[PDB]
Design a protein around this ligand. Sequence first.
Ligand SMILES: Cc1cc2nc3c(=O)[nH]c(=O)nc-3n(C[C@H](O)[C@H](O)[C@H](O)COP(=O)(O)OP(=O)(O)OC[C@H]3O[C@@H](n4cnc5c(N)ncnc54)[C@H](O)[C@@H]3O)c2cc1C
Length: 490
Amino acid sequence: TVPQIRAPSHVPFLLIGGGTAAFAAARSIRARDPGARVLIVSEDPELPYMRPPLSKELWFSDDPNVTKTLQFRQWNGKERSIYFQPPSFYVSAQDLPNIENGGVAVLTGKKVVHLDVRGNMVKLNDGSQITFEKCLIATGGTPRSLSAIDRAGAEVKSRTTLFRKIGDFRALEKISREVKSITVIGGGFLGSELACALGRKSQASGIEVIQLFPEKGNMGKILPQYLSNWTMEKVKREGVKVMPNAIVQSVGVSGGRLLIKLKDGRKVETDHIVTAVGLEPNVELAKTGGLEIDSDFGGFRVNAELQARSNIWVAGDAACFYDIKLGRRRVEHHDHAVVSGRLAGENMTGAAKPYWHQSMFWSDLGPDVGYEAIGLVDSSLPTVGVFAKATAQDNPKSATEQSGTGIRSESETESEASEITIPPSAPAVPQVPVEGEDYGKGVIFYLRDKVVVGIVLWNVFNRMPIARKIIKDGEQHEDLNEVAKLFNIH
Ligand SMILES: Cc1cc2nc3c(=O)[nH]c(=O)nc-3n(C[C@H](O)[C@H](O)[C@H](O)COP(=O)(O)OP(=O)(O)OC[C@H]3O[C@@H](n4cnc5c(N)ncnc54)[C@H](O)[C@@H]3O)c2cc1C
């Protein structure tokens, strides 16, 4: 067996990229047009898989075999495959045009590098060509790097990982068992999940874990300062040296270790760096395809139907879409990937439906801390937070036990509450006098006009439909403590 040239071929439905959005689009097309012939072409050799477990549950397991099988343990102890479907669900490219009732084929280890819109064709990196009738671009993005690491030498670039894939979890996991110290650069949800995860391994290994970022505290661009600060102390307590207000001036090699120099005088000595500083949408096809990239937000600009050009749609992290409440925007949400992929797939079969979904986001920092967000969440906005003591059910683990899944967009559902009526206050709880240290859950309302434009929920689950409805209706609430009763915050 030797390398060979693929003959030109044709496929009714071509999906460029094999991630969450591509997979959801393939199922949608198959549901809408039974017998459909769908081909996914994907650069990474792996079959389609969900990403959330990579910075999360896969680090919380004592079984060495999980790194190989990727059958991760949810917080409720129940196993789940990181893959959407196993190999048997798919067919090979070669067989697709001949199989009865059609199917979903997958061609991994191949990259589409040229899109010809008017000729309905693409070219792969190996020179072969595939004509299509309908095409979805769902190429995701590539992790951003740090400028200082880019200007940095071979030695340091060889000791920095960007965190996005299976390969990254595997390498970072191995490194956590080989070196004395690892630094996470990035204060966002993802960098924070990685810090907690290594801090947990640290309990057994004794490795040093540092997390550094330029904000005053974790997720500082998103959470109000008080909760950002609470969060920062929480992460630190997982055994992480957190360094806020840190701007990387340069990185170099000293003593055989990495030497990161900060603008303010500080210096960090460490053996490996993982960055989590955001994403660049994969838009290389915009050029041959004559597609518009959004100059303000990045990604492919699409219309209400997720369409970019004739017979071309985009979904997932790669799309700059028109949010029904916020206007042009792009997100990195698992929910959006699934919903938008499904809708694109439906539109590929002729539906012409607008994307009116309000995408949600969630983050877990271990089984005991969970956040959910929706709409415009920006710490520069005026905000109203309402809090209460947590009940036993108010944590990511219980939310996983109740629903049987850890992927929060699944358990929350994609729906929107049909009506909002402020329920009666709950029965009084006999208690000693309550202090701020005693709260463990809450809702934070983000405002613009006296209208709620965004919501972050802290340890409140199964209420996302209600948060969607409050944001959609756009009422001026006279008293947000009454509305918080909708989130069982009393
Ligand atoms: C580690 C991590 C944890 C996360 N946790 C959460 C969370 O808990 N909650 C939440 O809401 N969201 C979370 N997210 C975000 C969510 O997983 C993403 O929004 C989602 O993966 C985007 O899916 P996609 O299909 O749009 O893009 P991708 O998943 O990136 O898929 C794109 C695929 O296309 C391939 N590709 C790119 N270019 C080409 C090309 N030209 N030709 C062929 N193939 C190509 C790439 O190899 C890639 O496989 C997390 C993300 C990461 C990385």
